[PDB]
Design an enzyme around this catalytic site. Structure first.
Site, PDB file in Angstrom:
ATOM      1  N   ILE A  10       0.848  -1.186   0.000  1.00 22.35           N
ATOM      2  CA  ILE A  10       0.000   0.000   0.000  1.00 22.35           C
ATOM      3  C   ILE A  10       0.886   1.239   0.000  1.00 22.35           C
ATOM      4  O   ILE A  10       0.685   2.155  -0.793  1.00 22.35           O
ATOM      5  CB  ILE A  10      -0.914   0.061   1.260  1.00 22.35           C
ATOM      6  CG1 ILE A  10      -2.168  -0.777   1.044  1.00 22.35           C
ATOM      7  CG2 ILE A  10      -1.283   1.515   1.576  1.00 22.35           C
ATOM      8  CD1 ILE A  10      -3.006  -0.965   2.286  1.00 22.35           C
ATOM      9  N   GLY A  11       1.871   1.260   0.896  1.00 23.76           N
ATOM     10  CA  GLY A  11       2.746   2.412   0.977  1.00 23.76           C
ATOM     11  C   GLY A  11       3.853   2.332   2.011  1.00 23.76           C
ATOM     12  O   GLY A  11       4.182   1.270   2.541  1.00 23.76           O
ATOM     13  N   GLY A  13       4.958   4.303   5.465  1.00 22.33           N
ATOM     14  CA  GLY A  13       4.526   5.252   6.468  1.00 22.33           C
ATOM     15  C   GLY A  13       5.715   5.945   7.093  1.00 22.33           C
ATOM     16  O   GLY A  13       6.844   5.848   6.604  1.00 22.33           O
ATOM     17  N   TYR A  15       6.770   5.291  10.123  1.00 22.56           N
ATOM     18  CA  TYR A  15       7.494   4.282  10.903  1.00 22.56           C
ATOM     19  C   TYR A  15       7.758   2.934  10.258  1.00 22.56           C
ATOM     20  O   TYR A  15       8.714   2.251  10.623  1.00 22.56           O
ATOM     21  CB  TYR A  15       6.752   4.037  12.210  1.00 22.56           C
ATOM     22  CG  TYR A  15       6.399   5.324  12.913  1.00 22.56           C
ATOM     23  CD1 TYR A  15       7.374   6.071  13.588  1.00 22.56           C
ATOM     24  CD2 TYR A  15       5.095   5.821  12.870  1.00 22.56           C
ATOM     25  CE1 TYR A  15       7.040   7.288  14.204  1.00 22.56           C
ATOM     26  CE2 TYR A  15       4.759   7.030  13.473  1.00 22.56           C
ATOM     27  CZ  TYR A  15       5.727   7.751  14.135  1.00 22.56           C
ATOM     28  OH  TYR A  15       5.377   8.946  14.729  1.00 22.56           O
ATOM     29  N   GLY A  16       6.907   2.535   9.323  1.00 22.26           N
ATOM     30  CA  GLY A  16       7.117   1.251   8.691  1.00 22.26           C
ATOM     31  C   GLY A  16       6.345   1.082   7.409  1.00 22.26           C
ATOM     32  O   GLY A  16       5.512   1.922   7.059  1.00 22.26           O
ATOM     33  N   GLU A  77      -7.950  -0.921   9.743  1.00 17.42           N
ATOM     34  CA  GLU A  77      -9.092  -1.039   8.865  1.00 17.42           C
ATOM     35  C   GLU A  77      -8.536  -0.622   7.475  1.00 17.42           C
ATOM     36  O   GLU A  77      -7.642   0.234   7.387  1.00 17.42           O
ATOM     37  CB  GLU A  77     -10.152  -0.035   9.358  1.00 17.42           C
ATOM     38  CG  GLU A  77     -11.172   0.392   8.339  1.00 17.42           C
ATOM     39  CD  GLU A  77     -12.113   1.479   8.858  1.00 17.42           C
ATOM     40  OE1 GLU A  77     -13.080   1.789   8.136  1.00 17.42           O
ATOM     41  OE2 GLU A  77     -11.891   2.030   9.963  1.00 17.42           O
ATOM     42  N   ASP A 123       0.532  14.902  13.872  1.00 14.70           N
ATOM     43  CA  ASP A 123       1.152  14.925  12.549  1.00 14.70           C
ATOM     44  C   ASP A 123       0.150  14.684  11.419  1.00 14.70           C
ATOM     45  O   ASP A 123       0.371  13.847  10.554  1.00 14.70           O
ATOM     46  CB  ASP A 123       2.304  13.901  12.470  1.00 14.70           C
ATOM     47  CG  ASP A 123       3.139  14.061  11.207  1.00 14.70           C
ATOM     48  OD1 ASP A 123       3.147  15.183  10.631  1.00 14.70           O
ATOM     49  OD2 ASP A 123       3.793  13.070  10.785  1.00 14.70           O
TER      50      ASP A 123
HETATM   51  C1  LIG Z   1      -1.754   6.761   7.629  1.00 19.62           C
HETATM   52  C2  LIG Z   1      -1.065   6.519   6.339  1.00 19.62           C
HETATM   53  C3  LIG Z   1      -0.937   4.912   6.186  1.00 19.62           C
HETATM   54  C4  LIG Z   1      -0.012   4.408   7.341  1.00 19.62           C
HETATM   55  C5  LIG Z   1      -0.206   4.554   4.835  1.00 19.62           C
HETATM   56  C6  LIG Z   1      -2.442   4.216   6.236  1.00 19.62           C
HETATM   57  C7  LIG Z   1      -2.753   3.217   7.473  1.00 19.62           C
HETATM   58  C8  LIG Z   1      -4.204   2.537   7.453  1.00 19.62           C
HETATM   59  C9  LIG Z   1      -4.803   2.319   6.035  1.00 19.62           C
HETATM   60  N1  LIG Z   1      -6.003   1.736   5.697  1.00 19.62           N
HETATM   61  N2  LIG Z   1      -6.113   1.749   4.277  1.00 19.62           N
HETATM   62  C10 LIG Z   1      -5.024   2.331   3.749  1.00 19.62           C
HETATM   63  C11 LIG Z   1      -4.751   2.548   2.310  1.00 19.62           C
HETATM   64  O1  LIG Z   1      -3.707   3.119   1.950  1.00 19.62           O
HETATM   65  N3  LIG Z   1      -5.640   2.123   1.388  1.00 19.62           N
HETATM   66  N4  LIG Z   1      -5.412   2.310  -0.016  1.00 19.62           N
HETATM   67  C12 LIG Z   1      -4.154   2.708   4.883  1.00 19.62           C
HETATM   68  C13 LIG Z   1      -2.771   3.398   4.896  1.00 19.62           C
END
Ligand SMILES: CCC(C)(C)[C@@H]1CCc2[nH]nc(C(=O)NN)c2C1
Length: 294
Positions: A10-11, A13, A15-16, A77, A123
């Protein structure tokens, strides 16, 4: 974590890394954050675990916390996409005002809830505000800043953005109040309206001076105690305050009034999430559905 089949990344963050994953036992689709170590204050585990009880429709649900094998997993979630991607995707036509209003209204409810529980985010940024296809928007990563602090760079060395950072933090305040989140949300509100970051600083002093150039260099009149803050310097240039009519055109007077109260320098005077919800700007608030292609 062998209880999850990774679906895709997904990405990244603060921290991780974060993966979309399916619970191989409940079939639940979630966002799994994996944080990678010797010390690590156990207070962090306790603090983060407490967030499992901070449930609200406008707060991304923290399903579980798992500290194991030198890693900390946070099961969240799963939502469609973040506001940053939506804003970029809406850059040509802009997000319609009714939806911007709906999103701000919901974000303020999320903040009012957490602040009523004495939990601040610290943040907030478009990247951690998540939306679904039904018109809802939720705040993510709430409370992680208290447990881990906000680093200069993320775990991948990416620069942590300063654009939404409140002035009292930049000036060295030791204690952060819930006002810091209202400031960040105000900056996000301006960005949705104008389609350009409000204060795109590239260093702490650039960030602080960009704030000063628009809102005026703060003094003891508007902000009692400001000249006594740790990083305040009497040598700061003295800029004049600009009219919000120039700041966020073409937002109407109700919106400009609300934004101005969200960006007051004095944290003690900055509008609370609870008071913001009663602002006249929300008199005609609705819940439109966003256009989300795929
Ligand atoms: C707060 C930013 C982050 C840590 C990437 C989210 C945490 C929880 C979270 N739940 N859905 C997503 C998402 O990217 N969906 N396409 C994320 C990503």
């Amino acid at each position: 974590m062998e209880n999850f089949q990774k679906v895709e990344k997904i990405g990244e963050g603060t921290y991780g890394v974060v993966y979309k994953a399916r619970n191989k036992l409940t079939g639940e689709v979630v966002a799994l954050k994996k944080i990678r170590t010797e010390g690590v204050p156990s207070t962090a585990i306790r603090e983060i675990s407490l967030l499992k009880e901070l449930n609200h429709p406008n707060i991304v649900k923290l399903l579980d916390v798992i500290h194991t094998e030198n890693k900390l997993y946070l099961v969240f979630e799963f939502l469609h996409q973040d506001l940053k991607k939506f804003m970029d995707a809406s850059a040509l036509t802009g997000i319609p005002l009714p939806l911007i209003k709906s999103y701000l209204f919901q974000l303020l409810q999320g903040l009012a809830f957490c602040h009523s529980h004495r939990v601040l985010h610290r943040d907030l940024k478009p990247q951690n505000l998540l939306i679904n296809t039904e018109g809802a928007i939720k705040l993510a990563d709430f409370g992680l800043a208290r447990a881990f602090g906000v680093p200069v760079r993320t775990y991948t060395h990416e620069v942590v953005t300063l654009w939404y950072r409140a002035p009292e933090i930049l000036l060295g305040c030791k204690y952060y109040s819930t006002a810091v989140d209202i400031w960040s949300l105000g900056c996000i509100f301006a960005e949705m309206v104008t389609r350009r970051a409000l204060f795109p600083g590239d260093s702490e002093i650039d960030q602080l001076f960009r704030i000063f150039r628009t809102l005026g260099t703060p003094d003891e009149v508007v902000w009692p105690g400001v000249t006594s803050m740790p990083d305040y310097k009497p040598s700061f240039p003295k800029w004049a305050r600009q009219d919000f009519s120039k700041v966020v055109p073409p937002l109407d007077e109700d919106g400009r009034s609300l934004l101005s109260q969200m960006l007051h320098y004095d944290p003690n005077k900055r509008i609370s999430a609870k008071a913001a919800l009663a602002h006249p700007f929300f008199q005609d608030v609705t819940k439109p559905v966003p256009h989300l292609r795929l």
